[PDB]
Write a protein that binds this ligand. Structure first.
Ligand SMILES: CC(=O)Nc1ccc2c(c1)CCCC2=O
Ligand SMILES: [Cl-]
Ligand code: NA
Ligand code: NA
Lengths: 301, 302
Protein backbone atom coordinates (compact mmCIF):
# COMPACT_ATOMS: atom_id res chain seq x y z
CA UNK A 1 0.00 0.00 0.00
CA UNK A 2 0.97 3.69 -0.15
CA UNK A 3 1.29 6.02 -3.10
CA UNK A 4 4.33 8.18 -3.66
CA UNK A 5 5.69 10.31 -6.45
CA UNK A 6 8.42 7.79 -7.28
CA UNK A 7 11.41 8.42 -9.54
CA UNK A 8 13.40 5.79 -11.40
CA UNK A 9 16.64 4.65 -9.74
CA UNK A 10 19.16 7.10 -11.17
CA UNK A 11 22.38 5.05 -11.19
CA UNK A 12 22.35 4.25 -14.91
CA UNK A 13 22.20 7.99 -15.64
CA UNK A 14 24.65 9.06 -12.92
CA UNK A 15 27.32 7.09 -14.74
CA UNK A 16 26.80 9.24 -17.83
CA UNK A 17 26.96 12.73 -16.31
CA UNK A 18 29.99 14.88 -17.18
CA UNK A 19 31.02 18.51 -16.89
CA UNK A 20 31.33 20.56 -20.09
CA UNK A 21 33.21 23.85 -20.13
CA UNK A 22 33.60 26.36 -22.93
CA UNK A 23 35.17 29.70 -22.06
CA UNK A 24 33.82 30.84 -18.70
CA UNK A 25 30.65 28.71 -18.96
CA UNK A 26 30.34 25.35 -17.25
CA UNK A 27 27.30 23.08 -17.49
CA UNK A 28 26.41 19.38 -17.63
CA UNK A 29 26.78 16.91 -20.46
CA UNK A 30 25.44 13.42 -21.10
CA UNK A 31 28.13 10.86 -22.11
CA UNK A 32 26.81 7.90 -24.10
CA UNK A 33 29.19 5.66 -26.09
CA UNK A 34 31.76 8.14 -27.51
CA UNK A 35 29.48 11.23 -27.67
CA UNK A 36 28.81 13.96 -25.08
CA UNK A 37 25.47 15.76 -25.53
CA UNK A 38 24.92 19.21 -24.02
CA UNK A 39 22.92 22.40 -24.68
CA UNK A 40 24.43 24.37 -27.53
CA UNK A 41 24.15 27.62 -25.52
CA UNK A 42 27.32 26.57 -23.67
CA UNK A 43 29.12 28.36 -26.56
CA UNK A 44 27.37 31.71 -25.88
CA UNK A 45 29.10 34.71 -24.28
CA UNK A 46 27.28 37.55 -22.51
CA UNK A 47 26.98 39.23 -25.95
CA UNK A 48 25.24 36.20 -27.47
CA UNK A 49 22.20 35.89 -25.26
CA UNK A 50 19.61 37.73 -27.29
CA UNK A 51 20.32 36.81 -30.91
CA UNK A 52 23.06 34.17 -31.06
CA UNK A 53 24.08 32.85 -34.44
CA UNK A 54 25.05 29.40 -33.28
CA UNK A 55 26.45 28.41 -36.68
CA UNK A 56 28.79 31.42 -36.61
CA UNK A 57 29.77 30.89 -32.95
CA UNK A 58 30.45 27.19 -33.47
CA UNK A 59 32.54 27.47 -36.67
CA UNK A 60 35.05 29.52 -34.61
CA UNK A 61 35.61 26.76 -32.04
CA UNK A 62 38.13 23.94 -32.22
CA UNK A 63 37.83 20.63 -30.39
CA UNK A 64 40.28 21.77 -27.69
CA UNK A 65 38.11 24.79 -26.71
CA UNK A 66 35.67 22.24 -25.13
CA UNK A 67 36.87 20.86 -21.78
CA UNK A 68 34.98 17.68 -20.79
CA UNK A 69 35.63 16.30 -17.32
CA UNK A 70 34.27 12.91 -16.25
CA UNK A 71 34.84 12.54 -12.53
CA UNK A 72 38.53 13.38 -12.21
CA UNK A 73 39.42 12.42 -15.79
CA UNK A 74 39.64 14.85 -18.70
CA UNK A 75 38.18 13.42 -21.88
CA UNK A 76 39.65 14.34 -25.25
CA UNK A 77 37.23 16.00 -27.66
CA UNK A 78 38.00 14.76 -31.19
CA UNK A 79 34.99 16.15 -33.07
CA UNK A 80 31.97 18.38 -32.70
CA UNK A 81 28.66 19.00 -34.44
CA UNK A 82 25.39 20.73 -33.72
CA UNK A 83 22.03 19.01 -34.05
CA UNK A 84 19.12 21.43 -33.57
CA UNK A 85 19.76 22.93 -30.08
CA UNK A 86 22.19 20.28 -28.75
CA UNK A 87 25.91 20.11 -29.22
CA UNK A 88 27.39 16.65 -29.82
CA UNK A 89 31.04 16.46 -28.73
CA UNK A 90 32.78 13.35 -30.06
CA UNK A 91 35.29 12.13 -27.47
CA UNK A 92 38.16 9.66 -27.62
CA UNK A 93 36.73 7.25 -24.99
CA UNK A 94 33.48 5.33 -25.09
CA UNK A 95 31.78 5.55 -21.71
CA UNK A 96 32.24 2.09 -20.13
CA UNK A 97 29.17 2.76 -17.99
CA UNK A 98 26.90 3.44 -21.01
CA UNK A 99 23.55 1.72 -20.31
CA UNK A 100 21.19 0.28 -22.85
CA UNK A 101 19.43 3.45 -23.99
CA UNK A 102 17.27 5.20 -26.55
CA UNK A 103 16.10 8.75 -27.25
CA UNK A 104 12.34 9.30 -27.07
CA UNK A 105 10.38 12.52 -27.64
CA UNK A 106 7.45 12.61 -25.20
CA UNK A 107 3.99 14.17 -25.36
CA UNK A 108 2.38 16.50 -22.78
CA UNK A 109 1.13 14.53 -19.80
CA UNK A 110 4.01 12.04 -19.90
CA UNK A 111 6.09 11.76 -16.73
CA UNK A 112 9.82 11.19 -16.27
CA UNK A 113 12.55 11.37 -13.66
CA UNK A 114 15.00 14.28 -13.57
CA UNK A 115 18.56 13.85 -12.32
CA UNK A 116 19.46 17.39 -11.28
CA UNK A 117 23.23 17.93 -11.74
CA UNK A 118 25.79 20.69 -11.13
CA UNK A 119 29.35 20.65 -12.46
CA UNK A 120 28.72 17.17 -13.83
CA UNK A 121 27.88 15.76 -10.38
CA UNK A 122 24.34 14.53 -9.61
CA UNK A 123 22.56 16.38 -6.84
CA UNK A 124 19.10 14.83 -6.60
CA UNK A 125 16.38 12.93 -8.40
CA UNK A 126 12.71 13.81 -8.70
CA UNK A 127 9.67 13.07 -10.79
CA UNK A 128 8.29 15.60 -13.35
CA UNK A 129 5.59 15.72 -16.04
CA UNK A 130 5.57 17.46 -19.41
CA UNK A 131 2.87 20.10 -18.81
CA UNK A 132 0.23 20.76 -21.51
CA UNK A 133 2.05 24.07 -22.20
CA UNK A 134 5.32 22.16 -22.88
CA UNK A 135 7.08 23.41 -19.74
CA UNK A 136 8.09 21.32 -16.75
CA UNK A 137 7.76 22.34 -13.10
CA UNK A 138 11.28 21.42 -12.08
CA UNK A 139 13.75 22.35 -9.39
CA UNK A 140 16.83 23.79 -11.04
CA UNK A 141 19.48 26.31 -9.99
CA UNK A 142 22.11 28.09 -12.06
CA UNK A 143 24.49 25.46 -13.41
CA UNK A 144 21.79 22.80 -13.87
CA UNK A 145 21.66 23.16 -17.67
CA UNK A 146 22.30 19.85 -19.36
CA UNK A 147 20.62 17.86 -16.58
CA UNK A 148 18.43 15.20 -18.17
CA UNK A 149 15.02 13.58 -17.83
CA UNK A 150 14.48 9.88 -18.41
CA UNK A 151 12.41 6.76 -17.92
CA UNK A 152 13.78 3.26 -17.47
CA UNK A 153 11.83 0.58 -19.39
CA UNK A 154 13.38 -2.55 -18.02
CA UNK A 155 17.12 -2.02 -18.11
CA UNK A 156 16.79 0.44 -21.03
CA UNK A 157 17.07 4.18 -20.28
CA UNK A 158 14.75 6.31 -22.43
CA UNK A 159 16.23 9.83 -22.45
CA UNK A 160 13.44 12.33 -23.14
CA UNK A 161 14.53 15.72 -21.79
CA UNK A 162 17.62 17.92 -21.53
CA UNK A 163 17.32 21.09 -19.45
CA UNK A 164 18.09 24.43 -21.17
CA UNK A 165 16.44 27.34 -19.38
CA UNK A 166 14.11 28.81 -16.76
CA UNK A 167 11.24 31.01 -17.96
CA UNK A 168 10.13 34.12 -16.00
CA UNK A 169 7.30 32.32 -14.13
CA UNK A 170 9.84 29.93 -12.60
CA UNK A 171 9.06 26.92 -14.83
CA UNK A 172 11.50 25.17 -17.12
CA UNK A 173 12.03 24.54 -20.81
CA UNK A 174 14.30 22.17 -22.64
CA UNK A 175 14.76 19.81 -25.57
CA UNK A 176 14.57 16.17 -26.45
CA UNK A 177 17.96 14.51 -26.97
CA UNK A 178 17.79 15.32 -30.69
CA UNK A 179 17.87 18.97 -29.59
CA UNK A 180 14.29 19.85 -30.58
CA UNK A 181 12.66 22.06 -27.97
CA UNK A 182 9.43 21.08 -26.34
CA UNK A 183 6.92 23.77 -27.13
CA UNK A 184 7.44 27.05 -28.96
CA UNK A 185 10.56 28.01 -27.02
CA UNK A 186 13.98 29.00 -28.37
CA UNK A 187 17.46 29.14 -26.82
CA UNK A 188 17.50 32.97 -26.83
CA UNK A 189 17.06 35.41 -23.93
CA UNK A 190 14.28 37.31 -25.71
CA UNK A 191 11.00 37.64 -23.86
CA UNK A 192 9.07 34.41 -24.16
CA UNK A 193 6.34 33.24 -21.85
CA UNK A 194 4.70 29.90 -21.22
CA UNK A 195 1.13 29.48 -22.39
CA UNK A 196 -1.59 29.25 -19.78
CA UNK A 197 -1.21 25.92 -18.13
CA UNK A 198 -3.95 23.36 -17.76
CA UNK A 199 -4.52 20.27 -15.62
CA UNK A 200 -3.72 16.86 -17.17
CA UNK A 201 -7.19 15.32 -17.00
CA UNK A 202 -6.26 11.76 -17.99
CA UNK A 203 -3.63 11.67 -15.22
CA UNK A 204 -6.05 12.97 -12.55
CA UNK A 205 -8.42 10.17 -13.56
CA UNK A 206 -5.58 7.64 -13.37
CA UNK A 207 -4.79 8.85 -9.86
CA UNK A 208 -8.44 8.62 -8.80
CA UNK A 209 -8.32 4.97 -9.97
CA UNK A 210 -5.19 4.55 -7.83
CA UNK A 211 -7.07 5.88 -4.81
CA UNK A 212 -9.82 3.30 -5.42
CA UNK A 213 -7.23 0.54 -5.82
CA UNK A 214 -5.66 1.53 -2.48
CA UNK A 215 -9.10 1.36 -0.82
CA UNK A 216 -10.64 4.87 -0.98
CA UNK A 217 -14.12 5.32 -2.48
CA UNK A 218 -15.54 8.42 -0.73
CA UNK A 219 -15.52 10.62 -3.87
CA UNK A 220 -17.47 8.27 -6.15
CA UNK A 221 -21.10 9.05 -6.94
CA UNK A 222 -24.09 7.34 -8.50
CA UNK A 223 -23.84 9.33 -11.72
CA UNK A 224 -22.28 9.01 -15.15
CA UNK A 225 -21.62 11.56 -17.89
CA UNK A 226 -21.23 11.68 -21.63
CA UNK A 227 -17.73 12.44 -22.83
CA UNK A 228 -18.77 15.72 -24.39
CA UNK A 229 -20.60 16.95 -21.25
CA UNK A 230 -17.56 16.04 -19.17
CA UNK A 231 -15.29 18.09 -21.42
CA UNK A 232 -17.69 21.05 -21.41
CA UNK A 233 -17.53 21.12 -17.60
CA UNK A 234 -13.83 20.28 -17.17
CA UNK A 235 -12.66 23.01 -19.52
CA UNK A 236 -14.33 25.57 -17.28
CA UNK A 237 -11.80 24.53 -14.60
CA UNK A 238 -8.81 24.76 -16.99
CA UNK A 239 -8.67 20.98 -17.39
CA UNK A 240 -7.33 19.55 -20.65
CA UNK A 241 -9.90 17.90 -22.94
CA UNK A 242 -10.26 14.17 -22.44
CA UNK A 243 -10.12 12.32 -25.78
CA UNK A 244 -11.29 8.88 -26.79
CA UNK A 245 -7.61 7.90 -26.73
CA UNK A 246 -7.54 8.81 -23.05
CA UNK A 247 -10.76 6.86 -22.44
CA UNK A 248 -9.24 3.79 -24.11
CA UNK A 249 -5.98 4.14 -22.15
CA UNK A 250 -7.94 4.08 -18.86
CA UNK A 251 -9.60 0.77 -19.86
CA UNK A 252 -7.31 -1.49 -17.81
CA UNK A 253 -7.73 0.54 -14.59
CA UNK A 254 -11.47 0.68 -15.19
CA UNK A 255 -11.52 -3.13 -15.50
CA UNK A 256 -9.41 -3.63 -12.36
CA UNK A 257 -11.66 -1.44 -10.18
CA UNK A 258 -15.06 -2.09 -11.76
CA UNK A 259 -15.66 1.66 -12.30
CA UNK A 260 -16.43 2.68 -15.91
CA UNK A 261 -14.29 5.54 -17.25
CA UNK A 262 -17.26 7.87 -17.71
CA UNK A 263 -18.45 7.08 -14.16
CA UNK A 264 -15.04 8.16 -12.89
CA UNK A 265 -15.40 11.29 -15.05
CA UNK A 266 -18.65 12.00 -13.18
CA UNK A 267 -16.81 11.70 -9.84
CA UNK A 268 -14.14 14.14 -11.10
CA UNK A 269 -16.86 16.59 -12.22
CA UNK A 270 -18.31 16.51 -8.71
CA UNK A 271 -14.90 16.95 -7.10
CA UNK A 272 -14.32 20.08 -9.20
CA UNK A 273 -17.68 21.43 -8.09
CA UNK A 274 -17.46 20.52 -4.36
CA UNK A 275 -13.80 20.41 -3.44
CA UNK A 276 -12.70 17.84 -0.90
CA UNK A 277 -14.57 19.22 2.18
CA UNK A 278 -11.62 18.66 4.49
CA UNK A 279 -10.78 15.22 3.13
CA UNK A 280 -7.72 14.01 1.26
CA UNK A 281 -7.19 11.55 -1.57
CA UNK A 282 -3.97 9.53 -1.30
CA UNK A 283 -2.71 12.12 1.17
CA UNK A 284 -3.31 15.17 -1.07
CA UNK A 285 -5.79 17.99 -0.60
CA UNK A 286 -5.55 18.81 -4.34
CA UNK A 287 -6.20 16.68 -7.42
CA UNK A 288 -2.84 15.25 -8.54
CA UNK A 289 -2.06 15.25 -12.27
CA UNK A 290 1.56 14.02 -12.52
CA UNK A 291 0.87 10.23 -12.43
CA UNK A 292 0.06 8.69 -15.78
CA UNK A 293 -2.14 5.62 -16.30
CA UNK A 294 1.05 3.67 -16.90
CA UNK A 295 2.61 5.01 -13.66
CA UNK A 296 -0.42 3.93 -11.63
CA UNK A 297 -0.40 0.38 -12.97
CA UNK A 298 3.36 0.20 -12.28
CA UNK A 299 3.17 1.46 -8.69
CA UNK A 300 -0.14 -0.09 -7.59
CA UNK A 301 -1.64 -3.50 -8.31
CA UNK B 1 13.76 28.15 -8.92
CA UNK B 2 11.26 25.45 -8.10
CA UNK B 3 10.94 23.12 -5.13
CA UNK B 4 10.44 19.40 -5.48
CA UNK B 5 10.47 16.44 -3.15
CA UNK B 6 13.93 15.25 -4.05
CA UNK B 7 15.79 12.01 -3.30
CA UNK B 8 19.54 11.47 -3.24
CA UNK B 9 20.94 9.90 -6.44
CA UNK B 10 20.56 6.19 -5.74
CA UNK B 11 23.41 4.75 -7.85
CA UNK B 12 25.75 3.99 -4.93
CA UNK B 13 22.98 1.96 -3.24
CA UNK B 14 21.73 0.24 -6.43
CA UNK B 15 25.16 -1.39 -6.71
CA UNK B 16 24.57 -3.04 -3.33
CA UNK B 17 21.12 -4.60 -3.84
CA UNK B 18 20.83 -8.40 -4.08
CA UNK B 19 18.05 -11.00 -4.03
CA UNK B 20 17.86 -13.28 -0.97
CA UNK B 21 15.78 -16.46 -1.10
CA UNK B 22 15.09 -18.86 1.75
CA UNK B 23 12.58 -21.60 1.06
CA UNK B 24 9.57 -20.09 -0.69
CA UNK B 25 10.41 -16.51 0.41
CA UNK B 26 12.41 -14.14 -1.77
CA UNK B 27 13.16 -10.59 -0.65
CA UNK B 28 15.96 -8.02 -0.92
CA UNK B 29 19.37 -7.85 0.71
CA UNK B 30 22.06 -5.22 1.09
CA UNK B 31 25.54 -6.44 0.00
CA UNK B 32 28.39 -4.49 1.61
CA UNK B 33 31.97 -5.81 1.92
CA UNK B 34 31.44 -9.59 2.30
CA UNK B 35 28.08 -9.48 4.18
CA UNK B 36 24.46 -9.45 2.91
CA UNK B 37 21.99 -7.83 5.32
CA UNK B 38 18.27 -8.64 5.17
CA UNK B 39 15.25 -8.97 7.49
CA UNK B 40 15.52 -11.98 9.75
CA UNK B 41 11.89 -12.82 8.93
CA UNK B 42 13.12 -14.28 5.61
CA UNK B 43 13.61 -17.60 7.43
CA UNK B 44 9.98 -17.83 8.64
CA UNK B 45 7.15 -19.76 7.07
CA UNK B 46 3.72 -18.17 7.44
CA UNK B 47 2.96 -20.38 10.46
CA UNK B 48 6.35 -19.49 11.99
CA UNK B 49 5.47 -15.77 11.73
CA UNK B 50 2.55 -16.22 14.15
CA UNK B 51 5.05 -16.69 16.97
CA UNK B 52 8.65 -17.03 15.72
CA UNK B 53 11.58 -18.21 17.80
CA UNK B 54 14.25 -16.89 15.50
CA UNK B 55 17.34 -18.45 17.08
CA UNK B 56 15.64 -21.84 16.97
CA UNK B 57 14.57 -21.45 13.33
CA UNK B 58 18.07 -20.25 12.38
CA UNK B 59 20.01 -23.14 13.91
CA UNK B 60 18.02 -25.45 11.59
CA UNK B 61 19.21 -23.55 8.48
CA UNK B 62 22.55 -24.09 6.76
CA UNK B 63 24.51 -21.69 4.56
CA UNK B 64 23.26 -23.40 1.40
CA UNK B 65 19.62 -22.75 2.45
CA UNK B 66 20.24 -19.06 1.61
CA UNK B 67 20.28 -18.48 -2.13
CA UNK B 68 21.81 -15.04 -2.78
CA UNK B 69 21.75 -13.56 -6.29
CA UNK B 70 23.70 -10.45 -7.32
CA UNK B 71 22.21 -9.65 -10.70
CA UNK B 72 22.62 -12.92 -12.57
CA UNK B 73 25.56 -14.14 -10.45
CA UNK B 74 25.01 -16.44 -7.48
CA UNK B 75 26.89 -15.55 -4.31
CA UNK B 76 28.12 -18.31 -2.02
CA UNK B 77 26.96 -17.95 1.61
CA UNK B 78 29.69 -19.13 4.01
CA UNK B 79 28.29 -17.93 7.36
CA UNK B 80 25.09 -16.65 8.89
CA UNK B 81 24.19 -14.87 12.12
CA UNK B 82 21.63 -12.49 13.56
CA UNK B 83 21.95 -8.99 14.95
CA UNK B 84 18.64 -7.95 16.49
CA UNK B 85 16.09 -8.22 13.66
CA UNK B 86 18.55 -8.39 10.74
CA UNK B 87 20.12 -11.53 9.35
CA UNK B 88 23.78 -11.20 8.35
CA UNK B 89 24.84 -13.59 5.58
CA UNK B 90 28.59 -13.76 5.19
CA UNK B 91 29.48 -14.45 1.54
CA UNK B 92 32.67 -15.56 -0.26
CA UNK B 93 33.13 -12.33 -2.27
CA UNK B 94 33.33 -8.72 -1.17
CA UNK B 95 31.08 -6.42 -3.17
CA UNK B 96 33.43 -4.57 -5.58
CA UNK B 97 30.80 -1.80 -5.76
CA UNK B 98 30.76 -1.25 -1.96
CA UNK B 99 30.61 2.55 -1.44
CA UNK B 100 32.05 4.45 1.46
CA UNK B 101 29.31 3.91 4.06
CA UNK B 102 28.14 4.09 7.67
CA UNK B 103 25.18 2.65 9.59
CA UNK B 104 23.33 5.49 11.32
CA UNK B 105 20.12 5.59 13.32
CA UNK B 106 17.96 8.58 12.45
CA UNK B 107 15.62 10.63 14.65
CA UNK B 108 11.90 11.15 14.04
CA UNK B 109 11.44 14.15 11.77
CA UNK B 110 14.58 13.49 9.76
CA UNK B 111 14.30 12.52 6.10
CA UNK B 112 15.94 9.90 3.91
CA UNK B 113 15.69 8.40 0.44
CA UNK B 114 14.17 4.93 -0.01
CA UNK B 115 15.31 2.67 -2.86
CA UNK B 116 12.31 0.39 -3.34
CA UNK B 117 13.38 -3.03 -4.67
CA UNK B 118 11.79 -6.30 -5.86
CA UNK B 119 13.73 -9.56 -6.39
CA UNK B 120 16.98 -7.67 -5.78
CA UNK B 121 16.16 -5.23 -8.59
CA UNK B 122 15.71 -1.52 -7.77
CA UNK B 123 12.41 -0.22 -9.03
CA UNK B 124 11.96 3.31 -7.68
CA UNK B 125 13.38 5.96 -5.43
CA UNK B 126 11.48 8.38 -3.23
CA UNK B 127 11.97 10.63 -0.23
CA UNK B 128 10.47 9.78 3.21
CA UNK B 129 10.50 11.26 6.69
CA UNK B 130 10.66 9.19 9.86
CA UNK B 131 7.28 10.11 11.37
CA UNK B 132 6.97 11.11 15.04
CA UNK B 133 5.09 7.82 15.51
CA UNK B 134 8.17 6.01 14.03
CA UNK B 135 6.40 4.83 10.85
CA UNK B 136 7.12 5.92 7.31
CA UNK B 137 4.57 6.68 4.60
CA UNK B 138 6.23 4.60 1.94
CA UNK B 139 4.98 2.87 -1.16
CA UNK B 140 5.69 -0.83 -0.99
CA UNK B 141 4.16 -4.01 -2.42
CA UNK B 142 4.87 -7.63 -1.54
CA UNK B 143 8.51 -8.46 -2.21
CA UNK B 144 9.84 -5.06 -1.09
CA UNK B 145 11.12 -6.26 2.31
CA UNK B 146 14.79 -5.50 2.69
CA UNK B 147 14.57 -2.29 0.61
CA UNK B 148 16.72 0.36 2.30
CA UNK B 149 16.71 4.03 3.23
CA UNK B 150 19.76 6.26 3.19
CA UNK B 151 21.28 9.72 3.06
CA UNK B 152 24.48 10.75 1.29
CA UNK B 153 26.92 13.11 3.01
CA UNK B 154 29.70 14.02 0.57
CA UNK B 155 30.63 10.58 -0.84
CA UNK B 156 29.55 8.52 2.21
CA UNK B 157 26.24 6.64 2.15
CA UNK B 158 24.59 6.72 5.58
CA UNK B 159 22.23 3.71 5.67
CA UNK B 160 19.41 4.36 8.14
CA UNK B 161 16.45 2.08 7.30
CA UNK B 162 15.62 -1.43 6.13
CA UNK B 163 12.00 -2.23 5.32
CA UNK B 164 10.29 -5.07 7.28
CA UNK B 165 6.49 -4.74 7.29
CA UNK B 166 3.31 -2.85 6.48
CA UNK B 167 0.90 -1.83 9.27
CA UNK B 168 -2.91 -2.12 8.85
CA UNK B 169 -3.31 1.60 8.08
CA UNK B 170 -1.01 1.20 5.06
CA UNK B 171 2.09 2.87 6.59
CA UNK B 172 5.42 1.10 6.99
CA UNK B 173 7.76 -0.11 9.73
CA UNK B 174 11.38 -1.16 9.66
CA UNK B 175 14.72 -1.22 11.47
CA UNK B 176 18.02 0.52 11.29
CA UNK B 177 20.82 -1.53 9.71
CA UNK B 178 21.76 -2.88 13.14
CA UNK B 179 18.30 -4.50 13.31
CA UNK B 180 16.74 -2.16 15.91
CA UNK B 181 13.12 -1.30 15.02
CA UNK B 182 12.03 2.27 14.70
CA UNK B 183 8.93 2.33 16.87
CA UNK B 184 7.19 -0.14 19.20
CA UNK B 185 6.94 -2.86 16.55
CA UNK B 186 7.97 -6.51 16.36
CA UNK B 187 8.64 -8.79 13.40
CA UNK B 188 5.73 -11.13 14.01
CA UNK B 189 2.21 -11.56 12.64
CA UNK B 190 0.27 -10.15 15.62
CA UNK B 191 -2.01 -7.17 16.20
CA UNK B 192 0.01 -3.98 15.65
CA UNK B 193 -1.02 -0.44 14.83
CA UNK B 194 0.55 2.94 14.20
CA UNK B 195 0.13 5.35 17.10
CA UNK B 196 -1.48 8.72 16.57
CA UNK B 197 0.87 10.83 14.50
CA UNK B 198 1.78 14.48 14.84
CA UNK B 199 3.10 17.09 12.44
CA UNK B 200 6.82 17.91 12.35
CA UNK B 201 6.78 21.64 13.20
CA UNK B 202 10.41 22.52 12.40
CA UNK B 203 9.99 20.90 8.95
CA UNK B 204 6.80 22.87 8.18
CA UNK B 205 8.67 26.05 9.08
CA UNK B 206 11.59 25.00 6.84
CA UNK B 207 9.13 24.48 3.98
CA UNK B 208 7.54 27.87 4.61
CA UNK B 209 11.06 29.33 4.25
CA UNK B 210 11.49 27.38 0.99
CA UNK B 211 8.22 28.90 -0.21
CA UNK B 212 9.45 32.41 0.60
CA UNK B 213 12.77 31.79 -1.19
CA UNK B 214 10.65 30.77 -4.21
CA UNK B 215 8.50 33.93 -4.18
CA UNK B 216 5.46 32.51 -2.32
CA UNK B 217 4.99 35.17 0.38
CA UNK B 218 1.22 35.73 0.89
CA UNK B 219 1.18 34.09 4.37
CA UNK B 220 3.79 36.42 5.87
CA UNK B 221 2.48 38.96 8.37
CA UNK B 222 3.68 41.75 10.64
CA UNK B 223 3.42 39.75 13.86
CA UNK B 224 5.82 37.73 15.95
CA UNK B 225 5.31 35.39 18.88
CA UNK B 226 7.13 33.58 21.67
CA UNK B 227 8.14 29.94 21.90
CA UNK B 228 5.81 29.31 24.85
CA UNK B 229 2.84 30.99 23.16
CA UNK B 230 3.47 29.20 19.87
CA UNK B 231 3.93 25.79 21.54
CA UNK B 232 0.48 26.12 23.13
CA UNK B 233 -0.84 26.52 19.58
CA UNK B 234 1.23 23.60 18.27
CA UNK B 235 0.00 21.35 21.07
CA UNK B 236 -3.58 22.32 20.21
CA UNK B 237 -3.17 21.34 16.53
CA UNK B 238 -1.19 18.09 17.10
CA UNK B 239 2.11 19.66 16.09
CA UNK B 240 5.36 18.65 17.71
CA UNK B 241 6.76 21.17 20.22
CA UNK B 242 9.23 23.66 18.81
CA UNK B 243 12.44 23.73 20.83
CA UNK B 244 15.25 26.24 20.97
CA UNK B 245 17.44 23.83 19.03
CA UNK B 246 14.88 23.94 16.21
CA UNK B 247 15.00 27.75 16.23
CA UNK B 248 18.81 27.65 16.13
CA UNK B 249 18.78 25.16 13.22
CA UNK B 250 16.47 27.47 11.22
CA UNK B 251 18.81 30.40 11.94
CA UNK B 252 20.37 30.42 8.47
CA UNK B 253 16.98 30.51 6.77
CA UNK B 254 15.83 33.32 9.11
CA UNK B 255 18.85 35.49 8.22
CA UNK B 256 18.60 34.85 4.49
CA UNK B 257 14.90 35.69 4.20
CA UNK B 258 14.64 38.33 6.93
CA UNK B 259 11.85 36.38 8.63
CA UNK B 260 12.78 35.35 12.16
CA UNK B 261 11.61 31.93 13.30
CA UNK B 262 9.03 33.35 15.72
CA UNK B 263 7.88 35.77 12.99
CA UNK B 264 7.37 32.69 10.80
CA UNK B 265 5.73 30.91 13.77
CA UNK B 266 3.21 33.73 13.77
CA UNK B 267 2.53 32.98 10.07
CA UNK B 268 2.12 29.29 10.93
CA UNK B 269 -0.09 30.20 13.89
CA UNK B 270 -2.42 32.11 11.60
CA UNK B 271 -2.42 29.30 9.02
CA UNK B 272 -3.34 26.74 11.68
CA UNK B 273 -6.09 28.93 13.17
CA UNK B 274 -7.59 30.13 9.84
CA UNK B 275 -6.56 27.78 7.03
CA UNK B 276 -5.15 28.85 3.69
CA UNK B 277 -8.27 30.72 2.43
CA UNK B 278 -8.27 28.90 -0.90
CA UNK B 279 -4.62 29.65 -1.58
CA UNK B 280 -1.69 27.24 -1.98
CA UNK B 281 1.94 27.28 -0.89
CA UNK B 282 4.50 25.75 -3.27
CA UNK B 283 1.57 24.13 -5.03
CA UNK B 284 0.19 22.44 -1.92
CA UNK B 285 -3.08 22.92 -0.06
CA UNK B 286 -1.65 21.16 3.03
CA UNK B 287 1.26 22.24 5.19
CA UNK B 288 4.14 20.00 4.12
CA UNK B 289 6.33 18.53 6.87
CA UNK B 290 8.73 16.11 5.07
CA UNK B 291 11.51 18.64 4.24
CA UNK B 292 14.07 19.32 6.96
CA UNK B 293 15.89 22.66 7.31
CA UNK B 294 18.90 20.91 5.76
CA UNK B 295 16.83 19.66 2.81
CA UNK B 296 15.64 23.20 2.13
CA UNK B 297 19.12 24.75 2.31
CA UNK B 298 20.59 21.99 0.14
CA UNK B 299 17.93 22.26 -2.56
CA UNK B 300 17.65 26.06 -2.56
CA UNK B 301 21.47 26.52 -2.39
CA UNK B 302 23.51 23.64 -3.83
C1 LIG C 1 6.16 -15.67 4.76
C2 LIG C 1 5.40 -14.79 5.76
O1 LIG C 1 4.46 -15.23 6.33
N1 LIG C 1 5.85 -13.42 5.97
C3 LIG C 1 5.24 -12.47 6.91
C4 LIG C 1 3.86 -12.47 7.25
C5 LIG C 1 3.36 -11.53 8.17
C6 LIG C 1 4.23 -10.58 8.77
C7 LIG C 1 5.61 -10.59 8.43
C8 LIG C 1 6.10 -11.53 7.51
C9 LIG C 1 6.64 -9.56 9.09
C10 LIG C 1 5.99 -8.47 9.96
C11 LIG C 1 4.69 -8.84 10.64
C12 LIG C 1 3.72 -9.56 9.79
O2 LIG C 1 2.56 -9.37 9.94
CL1 LIG D 1 3.53 41.06 17.33
NA1 NA E 1 28.51 11.83 -12.33
NA1 NA F 1 4.63 37.37 11.03
Amino acid sequence: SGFRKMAFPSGKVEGCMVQVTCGTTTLNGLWLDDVVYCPRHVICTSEDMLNPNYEDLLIRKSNHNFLVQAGNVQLRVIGHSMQNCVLKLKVDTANPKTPKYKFVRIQPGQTFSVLACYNGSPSGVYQCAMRPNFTIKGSFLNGSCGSVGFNIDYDCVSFCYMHHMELPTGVHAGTDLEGNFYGPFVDRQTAQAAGTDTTITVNVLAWLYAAVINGDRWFLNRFTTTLNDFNLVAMKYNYEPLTQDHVDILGPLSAQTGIAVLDMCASLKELLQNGMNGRTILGSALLEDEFTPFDVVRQCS
